[PDB]
Amino acid sequence: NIVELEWDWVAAVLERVFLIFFTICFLFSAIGINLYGWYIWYTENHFL
C-alpha cells in the first residue's frame, strides 16, 4: 500500500534524526563533565 509506505519513510527519517541528536548530547555530557573535572584537578596539582 502506497499510504503505508509513505508513513514508513517518515518514521525512518525521524528515527535517524533522533540518532544524530542523542549522540551529540551524550558526547557533550560525558566529555564535558569529565574534562572540566580533570582541568580543575590539574591546575591545583601544579599550582600548589
Binding site: 519513510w9 525521524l14 528515527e15
Partner: protein
C-alpha cells in the same frame, strides 16, 4: 565507574534507533531501556561503599550519573514515538503535502535513501 556506564549508555543509544528493515514493524524497545536502567542502577548503588552520599550538594560524579539516566529515559520514549508515527499508515490517510515536502529535504543531510520498492510504487 565512568567508563562502563558511558559504554553502556552509548550501546543503548545505538540500539534504540537502529532497525533491520525500513518497511517493517519495529519492536517495543521498552525492555531494553528497563534493562539498561537496571544495569546502571546496579553499578551506582552497589559500589556505593565509597560514594560521598551527601545531601549538602550534588557532587560531580552524581551530576554525571543523572544525565545518563534522563537521556536513556527520554530515549525510550522517543523510540516509542517512532512506532506511533509508523502505525498512522493503518488508518488510510496519506501524509500532508507539507509533511512530505519537509521530509525529502532533510533526508540528503540525514544521509538516508529511498528504498527500491518505494520508487517502484511511485512509478506505477
Amino acid at each position: 565507574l565512568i567508563a562502563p556506564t558511558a559504554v553502556i549508555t552509548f550501546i543503548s543509544i545505538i540500539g534504540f534507533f537502529t532497525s533491520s528493515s525500513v518497511h517493517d514493524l519495529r519492536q517495543e524497545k521498552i525492555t531494553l531501556g528497563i534493562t539498561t536502567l537496571l544495569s546502571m542502577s546496579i553499578m551506582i548503588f552497589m559500589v556505593s561503599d565509597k560514594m560521598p552520599s551527601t545531601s549538602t550538594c550534588v557532587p560531580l560524579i552524581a551530576l554525571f550519573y543523572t544525565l545518563m539516566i534522563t537521556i536513556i529515559s527520554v530515549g525510550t520514549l522517543a523510540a516509542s514515538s517512532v512506532i506511533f508515527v509508523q502505525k498512522l499508515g493503518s488508518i488510510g490517510n496519506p501524509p500532508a503535502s507539507k509533511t512530505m515536502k519537509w521530509t525529502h529535504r532533510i533526508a540528503p543531510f540525514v544521509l538516508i535513501q529511498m528504498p527500491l520498492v518505494m520508487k517502484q510504487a511511485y512509478a506505477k
